[PDB]
């Protein structure tokens, strides 16, 4: 079953519906990286479902009363009211973004030498940790890391893993627990509320912090909802709510689940912690009561947030991805599995067996996408991972995958339609295909300017 | 066959059902006339496509961009340089919406006693051309008036009819020719420009002006691009102006193709005519130079107006309106055909066969529609048609129909499909909507807020 | 004393700056015609006060949330249920703005033959009640047609001159009497809460009915707070009641005191005529839940309204309004007297008493207050009155004025400062001040593009 | 000789005043830091010019064309092209506001144990020099420190301090020269282009780097525009970009002199420096292509920095201070002098000659001004001069002064006559202001937080 949107569209965004002759030009002028298009060239636009999502009417009338004062602002009071009712925690500093918490959580919580147990990572998060004196250990469950196994709540942590790092390392050695929520190394994948308990018993009987990557927080509740034994009852709210009862704190990217563009914020309950977060936020972001946001972002974030809460929001939300994940899958289109709450992510390794990973199957997918269809998608391969530089070689991940991220409120089936015909009439001619061979590759951030040629 | 939808959500607007027990009450208190219902109580509202559209992020835009003044606003000159370009007439008064103008035209160009002849009557366009004294003649072809008869441009005018009006009342006896485009009350059907050259030759012979009722002109030029030969490779905005040559001006309700919520304007080309207009409209809708309009309202109706001119806009617009239709005839529901520029007409006439058109069968069904669906739907047959203004009998039209009018920009293929499978499970028990007789009737356009009372 | 704005600039509208010998070449452009210049080359745009204001932040943000439902919208609801608290009465029919409510009170309340009585007219008000076949009667107190009589609520009826008409055509042959807040013509000039309740007690012992033509009550309002002994302990809101329970309807513009940019409404107490309202207002208007206005706008002046009663924007309204005036007749500039709520009125004959009024001394004066200023006012005197279509004479008012206008929120004190020091520089050198003679006059509307050049 | 307002007012925000019982017990809960009291509690906020700016008509038109994409957005473009026409540079960085770039660029430029010059510190960027390693050199002027000292172009640097700094320690040990514009904590003080070009003209010479502080740099070309010989016929544009033809980058807080409410970048022609930047900016900001930013405001932010080089625009802005120094000097009320470009700065030390600088007479006195007027004002002495991080005392600077900060088009001349009249009659009685000590001093950037008690 596949619900419709449960909203209707109060107004657009205008593209431009260029051919596929003129989409090869502009493919060619950004060099067969996807990541070099121009914005108005593209239909469809699946780079990243990070701030790229669509407000309510709501939410732009709170855009028009922006209280902009340095200190004091209405706007923050209504976000800290909001974030203190919808995930329980007792202090909420507003951050510009999901990565300007993480970093006053990484220089509040770590002292040097100390480790960080996450169930996998996410680029910038275990930037943050390392940055600050930290060893990362990943403690997610084995089955996490095999992308085509079908089971529930891949995201899990692995309770033995923790407490075998807790008995080698030492309690007072681990700086906290980082528990993500999606995974989304995993290809989104949640985790139970099951699972969220034993960590926080675990780890709360040896004076253990644990702090949430809430970013898909919202994701991670309807996966709960609709699959976790014995939450059929509840609502997606009193999951939030119970999900973040199990930890010390957490740092949240509005730009996902908060249905924003902009916005993010970090939360505790200690008051010490609070007090230093305070002390911190000043050098970075800004006042605890803007945190490097205009007043009327944090308004749209509060109003968002609790949007996200509504069950017919967030089902859409997830079945929509789901639905384009299942007509890929139906046509035998390879993809990680389980589909995740905010992505497909297609196999470029198996799409494009007849190329080496030295030859950029993704990178080369992800442009061909792009020439049929006007749906841009993120290379998340071999590129992406970057290049040694000490020994000169590829970073080569096992996973060569292209993501189709899709954007909260943004697109509709008939758009999932272009996006899976159109892959699927690539797949059927397949070897097709060609490599891709650098013709400029810059010393860092690769992934954002290389530009290609065919092989 | 079905195109994705030819831009992005930008931002939406929650929707949302009452329980089935508590659409009931809301229709006996709405007195069973979908009319009466209010917005909220209301989850997919296909009332009309009249001021329900979804603007653009560019009208949004210029609705920041409000010139306020009481003259020589740059919203004016904008808008009219936009009409003047598009509709190539030499004179345009802004008007609120299509009423304030088809007002100033009829009394402009109508002496008492004097025939005015349509392709078929309108409500409010028939109200004033007989309360300032015409006579309407209604010379659309036999055909329009017969709901399952598939013929394309059934909106034509019949040549014969109106020659035989000019040789039996004298060319001076005709206060001008209304053509409208689409044909609304046919079920929304186009006008060839076949059709509209061979009117105005026959009536520039005769000295007869012709005006046009612009308000779907351009869901017009689609399907004269689509099906007329000799068109497949003009532009819209080609046939556009091509189809206003045919005209000695027009009517316009911005509410429907211009993309916008409110708004409207008479164009003209004759100097003296324009010169009565700027006196009329001072009267009733303000001065030339915003028409009852705020400056922002002519301004998102400049840009709507020109935006209505991308081709795949409006190629959606129409074959998403088809995709309700081709699935309801697919399932047996009978409905007008061919579909239209703008709804989907039911035939009321089938769908409730066990009852006379004195037991207003398509009344009836549009409050049942509501009650088993909580999507609103209008009455469009006898009980708009009035009454003949001479014996006091009801007007008694071959179509009686409820109208799903699909508002532009703002539904979904999903939300039709919504739509239409609560149709189709309706017609398994069409034989339960009762008939319907008057408590209230107003004197005059009596559909707008008639209350009736179960037979 | 002046208070200063009870508000801060949210946002501002950009404005061309030209300097002087520009300012000439665009006033010669217009034919020396203010109305004829452009709104972008106009700095201080004083015009008229209809439609110009300054909306808030909360109005914006209620312009987000429209919902644009064509029957039953939640911003009718809203603008109905304000009304009703605010204004007492028990029926309210939305229009585009103030004349369709006019047109809709004078169609409803006259039979041909019959007389209206009112304090002076307003020229749409008289023009519907003329039109639909009754006699004006003016029945103010003389003292309000000396224009330099400087004395309280000039605005005032004589219930001398209304006994007057009762005892002479009868009370059955009386349509309504029309009682203006505040007067217009006589400068902007309010009516006491004592007239108010005298003209009711008088009318109701005969039956007659009174509507209140209500565009300026705010500002009416005020000055009953200012000046009527009792009335200090009296927030405006209540004062607004009281007045308006002294009447069984109203007509009016929003565009006015309810701070929007369009609007209007009618308001009635019976319901028989109210049912006749909701039958005629979809011929010209709309349906009786939005009344040719789109649904934020319902809610733009839904929430206008209710900022209008705030006793600090009203306080700051007038006594922005009489700063100018009290600067300019300190400095000895001829003004009418007192102040009204919304302008002020520069007596060009006293002026320019070198010019004779067919060299039109208004017209020329305010041609020259632009080219000094870059500020635009309305001509009113012998060009605004127009020409005897059958004798071809000029019509002659006694007064001949220049009217600075004064939107709502608009300006500062610094702007009026602009306009008062360029008045009073002109007026310093007065004699050189040039009449000016026609070279385009159209048949009608002449104040609106007619074209002069200097004698 | 104060020229009005170049704009109108496009919307509106409500202000009030709580009476002086609540203003007090609010003053103790913020613990006599103006910093920690809330919005709503204000009637005029003068703590900051920062992000408290009204944006234009223009701007907000922009905000409805937010191209929210993560890499290519036309809002970036647009940004990108304007910085690179106005300020000359060859790179730009968005950063989500000032403080994020210049934790860039001290992170870019500074070696630990590397020498950073300045002409005066800010709180902001000299911690970010520290904690990167350098050790801050003023080379500002001795006359920038005397706030009774009316001298032209305060903030310049003298050029015998710089060239000491460089013969004492190398030029290799000297980071960079951080060239503020205008000088924030001298009083908002000005730099001449000709000391901008020696400045220039020495570092080259020694391969030092020098890059701005631009936050005020459009203040600082009116400054020049008006005062500097030879610069009185060029443009406001013209002059910024000259200015920045001295410099080999900039730092930008967007939100005061672009115009809005957030955002700022980073500028360098460095090539190397850039790609460095890139790599950093995602660690803290996001990604290159939006720096932290909405797409929105980045649009925003290129529409307000060209919006800034309107003289009249910068003339009023600047003319609007100078009003309220005028007025507060006229009373024998002591500042700063001359008045600066965003801001009037009692001098705290006069005001409250009674008290020691120990006693912080500048937090008392912000405090007093809020108790007894409600405006609100921020502490500019030795809370905010933080501690030498060696010794462990107060940094003690001879500027003890209280901030009268002006958001740019926010205000009114009568706004500013309310301030002037209040601190004026509290003038007449300082003697009452008590002396200030710490109950709670956070460990850097203490003035934001920070909490106090009379002694
Ligand atoms: C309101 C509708 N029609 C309006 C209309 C009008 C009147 O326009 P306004 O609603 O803008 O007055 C004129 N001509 C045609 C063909 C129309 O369809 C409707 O069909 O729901
Ligand atoms: C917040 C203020 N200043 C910010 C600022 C900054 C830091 O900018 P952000 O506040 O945008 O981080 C940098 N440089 C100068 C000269 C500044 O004045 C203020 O003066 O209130
Ligand atoms: N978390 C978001 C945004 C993101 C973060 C870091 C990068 O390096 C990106 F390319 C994008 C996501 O999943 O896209
Ligand atoms: N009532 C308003 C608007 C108005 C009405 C009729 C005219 O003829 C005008 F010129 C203006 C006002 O006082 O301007
Ligand atoms: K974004
Ligand atoms: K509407
Ligand atoms: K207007
Ligand atoms: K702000």
Redesign the interface.
């Known amino acids: 079953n ?14 431009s ?1 260029i051919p596929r002759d003129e989409r090869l030009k502009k493919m060619q002028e950004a060099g067969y990286n996807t ?6 060239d ?1 239909y ?2 699946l ?2 479902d ?25 706007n923050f ?1 209504h976000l800290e009211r909001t974030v203190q009712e919808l995930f329980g925690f007792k202090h909420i500093v507003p951050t ?2 999901g ?2 918490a993480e ?1 006053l959580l990484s220089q509040l919580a770590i002292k040097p030498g100390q480790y960080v147990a996450g169930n996998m990572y996410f680029t ?1 998060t275990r ?2 940790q390392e ?1 600050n004196g930290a060893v990362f250990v990943d403690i997610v469950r084995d089955e996490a890391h095999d992308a085509g196994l079908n089971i529930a709540f891949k995201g899990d942590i692995d309770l033995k893993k923790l407490q075998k790092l807790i008995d080698e390392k030492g309690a007072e050695n681990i700086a906290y627990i980082c528990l993500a929520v999606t995974v989304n190394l995993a290809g989104g994948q949640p985790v139970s509320m099951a699972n969220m308990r034993a960590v926080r018993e675990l780890t709360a009987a040896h004076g253990i912090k644990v702090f949430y990557d809430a970013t898909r927080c919202v994701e991670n509740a309807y996966f709960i909802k609709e699959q976790e034994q014995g939450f059929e009852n509840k609502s997606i709210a009193e999951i939030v709510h119970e999900m973040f009862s199990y930890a010390d704190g957490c740092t949240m990217s509005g730009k996902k689940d908060c249905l924003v ?2 916005g993010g914020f970090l939360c505790m309950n200690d008051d010490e912690m609070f007090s230093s977060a ?2 911190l936020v ?7 009561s ?1 945190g ?6 944090m308004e749209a974030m509060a109003i968002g947030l609790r ?1 996200a809460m ?1 069950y017919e ?1 967030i089902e859409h939300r997830v079945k929509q991805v789901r639905y384009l994940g299942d007509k890929l899958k139906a046509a035998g289109v390879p993809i990680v599995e389980p589909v995740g709450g905010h992505a497909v992510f297609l196999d470029a390794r198996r799409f494009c067996e007849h190329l080496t990973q030295d030859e950029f199957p993704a990178q080369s997918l992800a442009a061909s996408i792009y020439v049929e269809t006007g749906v841009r998608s993120m290379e998340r391969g071999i590129i992406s991972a970057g290049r040694n530089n000490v020994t000169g070689e590829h970073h080569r991940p096992k996973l060569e995958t292209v993501r189709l991220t899709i954007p909260r ?7 999932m ?2 996006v899976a015909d159109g892959i699927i009439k690539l797949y059927q001619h397949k070897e097709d295909i060609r490599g891709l061979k650098f013709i400029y590759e ?4 690769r992934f ?1 300017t290389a530009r290609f040629d065919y092989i």
Chains 1, 2, 3, 4 share one sequence.
């Open positions: 596949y619900p419709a949107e449960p909203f209707r569209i109060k107004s657009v965004e205008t593209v519906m990541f070099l298009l121009n914005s108005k593209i469809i636009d780079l990243t990070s701030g790229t999502n669509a407000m309510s009417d709501k939410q732009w009338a709170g855009m028009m009363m922006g209280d902009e004062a340095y200190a004091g602002s209405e009071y510009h973004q990565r300007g970093n910038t930037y943050h940055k563009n902009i305070k002390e000043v050098v970075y972001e800004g006042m605890p803007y490097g946001l205009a007043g009327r972002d949007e509504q929001y409120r943004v697109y509709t089936y008939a758009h339609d272009v810059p010393k860092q951030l954002f």
